[PDB]
Design a protein around this nucleic acid. Structure first.
Lengths: 106, 123, 183, 117, 173
RNA sequence: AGAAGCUCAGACGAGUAGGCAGGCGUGGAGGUUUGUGACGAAGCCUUGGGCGUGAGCCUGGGUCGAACAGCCUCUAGUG
RNA sequence: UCUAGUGGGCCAUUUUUGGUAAGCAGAACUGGCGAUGCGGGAUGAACCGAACGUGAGGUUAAGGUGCCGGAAUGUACGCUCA
RNA sequence: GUACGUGAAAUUGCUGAAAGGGAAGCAUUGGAAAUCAGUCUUA
């Protein structure tokens, strides 16, 4: 069953914020195995998606997806910043995202 | 008196052919070509001008002169077209080539749309 | 813009409604050939990242204007000749495959182009029953796929462990970090 | 030039939510100790000229036309020259008969009707 | 007078009305809320039991200061009472409603109380006398009661999804 | 090219007391609109739609029953 | 040229008077608050940074990066056991 | 239907929908559910 998962696991940490002001437009994403801004440089520009399931089958499918792109690194620990077509809901903190391997440059 | 003072009196604000709204005003003048309130296009305010209107499947064109401006009954001359839209366009710019040509584009638009009005009425 | 310049019994155009239909300004953008990634040499084994053939390993035949006319040997991994965008392949460091012996000039945009529709009406159960591998798929396309497939068998048979490598599917497992591993 | 709106939510009056004698229609706060007037963080925002929309797309419907109020066929023929800029909108008090006449004239003129249905 | 409910079309429903009834509106609301949705015969048995102090009408909304009782446990509450005057008015209106069903020609076995509403009628103004030469209101809260009894009574598929569905259909069979 | 129009460019944008300008809305008057209306005016309600930075305006549905409005100006017991 | 509002002020730096002292009274220069949001000082009218049309992107001030909290459980050398 | 033209808001009952661990209301951003229009359809 381990012949799939062409993506990389990630977790939605929070929004771009100060102590008291948030910016929901851009999200902070922590990619598994990425521990520095040098490693995050590889994942800049990749397509990160949030997959979720809902009751009503739009297109006859139970799964909806919010697409997005990795924009720039964040901090020294390898977290990146992402812009999604629809801003991510605030309840998806700690939810898992999927970072595809494309647009590839390797 | 003169065309300038006529426009200053009428035109601008109060006329029986003026339709003001939020910030835009239409000229319902039966002698205006574009339907816009302007010196260029108000035959009340300016000297000899053209225009066109519709009736029962055919079109008629109004024209003016200068020396006869004191006789309202016979001031304005009507010419009638009931042949074709292309021919109607031919008649208009023929009757305006020897005339101030600024109105040829606007008139030909009025003819061609009124003909489209007739076709849509038929359909 | 009058009728003496363009006289006719029907006019050059029937009707002239609305505004002057403002012409766009003359652009200063010229098409230039795409500078493709250096590692995408013809005959290289690359991994398809997206599409119905995700994870498959295929052999690059030729570089198209924007995409790669790529196919794995259809008898190996069952991937017919397709364009794949250069952003959706991973050029692996596997040994190159000799593709000089097969013609690639017949693979063009018109060769892979779809049919014109120009109509919003589409879709049907019979439409899904149509197309398919069984219908359409001209015998000319069949022959080219067979010819190029047979031409690429001798190379992959010469290099050991390449036939099974192509038949396999790429996949990430636990503890694999793409920015570390080199393909 | 596509139609964009700088802001889509309305400007409701401060505390119109909490008091029924205070309607939602906007009023400038004149208070000496008003949080909204002093523009504290988290409080509601006030109308500004910066919020104004593009002069090119202003007053235009999402379809690119401007609604024009129509009372009769004479008002429809006013839109003869501008069927690509204004869309006729029949008045509320027009009877059913004159309404049918207005729509038939608008169709012949090729002028869109915002409340045809 | 028009009723509260869009249903009660005369086909299978019977109505009863009571206007400006000189009884407490708050008590009448508790009785109506208790008997709502019950069958006609079981409603009569319950109202008889309340008049006999065997079952109680639970005071749920207007229950400030009401005492606890052991007969409110059957409804899961603690505060219940036995308003006899309100029971009488509801009993009389239910007699009227079943009489209307008899006249219409319904079946009495499966009659249920489909709808029952109580509205506040215009107050009756009276006067009480307080200390220090003061005069105060002593108003009455009447009730409007109306009762209604009645008998118990594709997506389209994209191109790639369609091709996949066809492939699976062919491969399964 | 409603020359009271059109067009190019740069700089700038806090605000109580206070000043000034341009607008929005209400009652009545002169002019105007071949203006709306018992085939439904005004008013009213609305989990509908559109316009404006805003004051506000328009509209669909329901309720209703005899009048009412746009533009130019006059006026005031005008928010 | 005509006219409105004002003719109770308060705080900070430095200088200073009366005072046992004061979140005390009285002054001098400048900047603030009153009239002024915003980031930081946990919080606060005048402290620090910075002064505000509607937004997008980038970069910073003061202040910060164990968690709450966006950001190194960073690097180097030491002191400290309460 | 004389408790009579129109019949507003406060307040109230019923129904449907949803929320609710010591207030509520509000602003920004999106999810979910509900609802809706433009747009195209054609020239």
């Amino acid at each position: 069953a381990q012949g799939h998962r062409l993506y990389v696991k990630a977790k939605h940490l929070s929004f771009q914020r100060s102590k008291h002001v948030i910016h929901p437009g851009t999200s902070i994403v922590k990619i598994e195995g990425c521990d520095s801004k040098e490693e995050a440089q590889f994942y800049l520009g990749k397509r990160v998606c949030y997959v979720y399931k809902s009751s009503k089958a739009v297109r006859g499918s139970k799964i909806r997806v919010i697409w997005g792109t990795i924009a720039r690194p964040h901090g020294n620990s390898g977290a990146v910043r992402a812009r999604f077509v629809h801003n991510l809901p605030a309840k998806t903190f700690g939810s898992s995202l999927r970072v595809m391997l494309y647009p590839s440059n390797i | 008196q003169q065309d300038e003072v006529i426009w200053q009196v009428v035109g601008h604000e109060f006329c029986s052919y003026r339709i003001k709204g939020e910030a835009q005003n239409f000229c319902r003048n039966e002698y205006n070509v574009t339907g816009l309130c302007n010196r260029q296009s108000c035959p009340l305010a300016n000297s000899r001008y053209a225009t066109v209107r519709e009736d029962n499947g055919k079109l008629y064109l109004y024209m003016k002169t200068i020396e006869r401006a004191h006789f309202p009954s016979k001031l304005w001359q009507r010419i009638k077209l009931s042949k074709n839209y292309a021919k109607a366009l031919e008649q208009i710019d023929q009757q305006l080539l020897y005339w101030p040509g600024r109105q040829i584009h606007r008139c030909k638009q009025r003819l061609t749309r009124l003909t489209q009005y007739l076709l849509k009425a038929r359909r | 813009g009058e009728r003496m310049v363009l006289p006719a019994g029907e006019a050059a155009a029937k009707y002239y409604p609305a505004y002057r239909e403002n012409v766009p300004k003359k652009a200063r953008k010229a098409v230039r050939p795409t500078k493709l990634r250096a590692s995408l040499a013809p005959g290289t084994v690359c991994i398809l990242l997206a599409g119905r053939f995700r994870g498959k390993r295929v052999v690059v035949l030729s570089q198209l204007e924007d995409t790669l006319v790529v196919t794995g040997p259809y008898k190996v991994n069952g991937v017919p000749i397709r364009r794949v965008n250069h952003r959706y392949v991973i050029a692996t460091s596997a040994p190159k495959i000799d593709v000089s012996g097969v013609s690639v000039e017949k693979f063009t945009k018109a060769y892979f182009a779809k049919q014109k529709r120009s109509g919003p009406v589409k879709k049907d159960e019979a439409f899904f029953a149509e197309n398919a591998p069984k219908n359409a798929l001209p015998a000319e396309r069949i022959a080219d796929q067979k010819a190029v497939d047979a031409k690429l068998l001798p190379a992959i048979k010469a290099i050991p462990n390449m036939k099974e490598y192509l038949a396999a599917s790429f996949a990430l497992s636990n503890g694999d970090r793409p920015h570390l591993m080199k393909f | 030039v596509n139609i964009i709106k700088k802001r889509t939510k309305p400007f409701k009056r401060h505390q119109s939510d909490r008091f029924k004698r205070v309607g939602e229609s906007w009023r400038k706060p004149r208070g000496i100790d008003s949080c909204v007037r002093r523009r504290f963080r988290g409080t509601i925002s006030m109308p500004k000229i910066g919020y104004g929309n593009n002069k090119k797309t202003r007053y235009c419907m999402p379809n690119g036309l401007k609604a024009f109020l129509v009372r009769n066929v004479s008002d429809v023929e006013l839109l003869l020259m501008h069927n690509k800029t204004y869309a006729a909108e029949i008045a509320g008090n027009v009877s059913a008969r004159k309404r049918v006449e207005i729509v038939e004239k608008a169709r012949a003129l090729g002028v869109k009707v915002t409340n045809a249905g | 007078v028009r009723y509260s409910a869009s249903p009660a079309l005369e086909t299978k429903c019977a109505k009863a009305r009571g206007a400006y009834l000189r009884t407490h509106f708050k008590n009448s609301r508790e009785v109506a809320f208790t008997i709502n949705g019950m069958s006609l015969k079981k409603a009569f048995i319950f109202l008889d039991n309340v008049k006999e102090h065997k079952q109680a009408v639970p005071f749920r909304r207007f229950n400030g200061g009401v005492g606890r009782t052991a007969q409110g446990k059957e409804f899961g509450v603690t505060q219940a009472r036995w308003p006899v005057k309100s029971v009488k008015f509801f009993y009389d209106l239910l007699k009227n409603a079943e009489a209307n069903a008899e006249a219409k020609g319904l079946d009495m076995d499966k009659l249920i109380i489909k709808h029952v509403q109580v509205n506040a009628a215009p107050k009756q103004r009276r006067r009480t006398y307080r200390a220090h030469g003061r005069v105060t209101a002593y108003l009455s809260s009447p009730s409007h009661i109306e009762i209604i009894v009645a008998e118990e009574e594709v997506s389209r598929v994209s191109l790639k999804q369609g091709a996949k569905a066809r492939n699976l259909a062919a491969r399964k069979a």
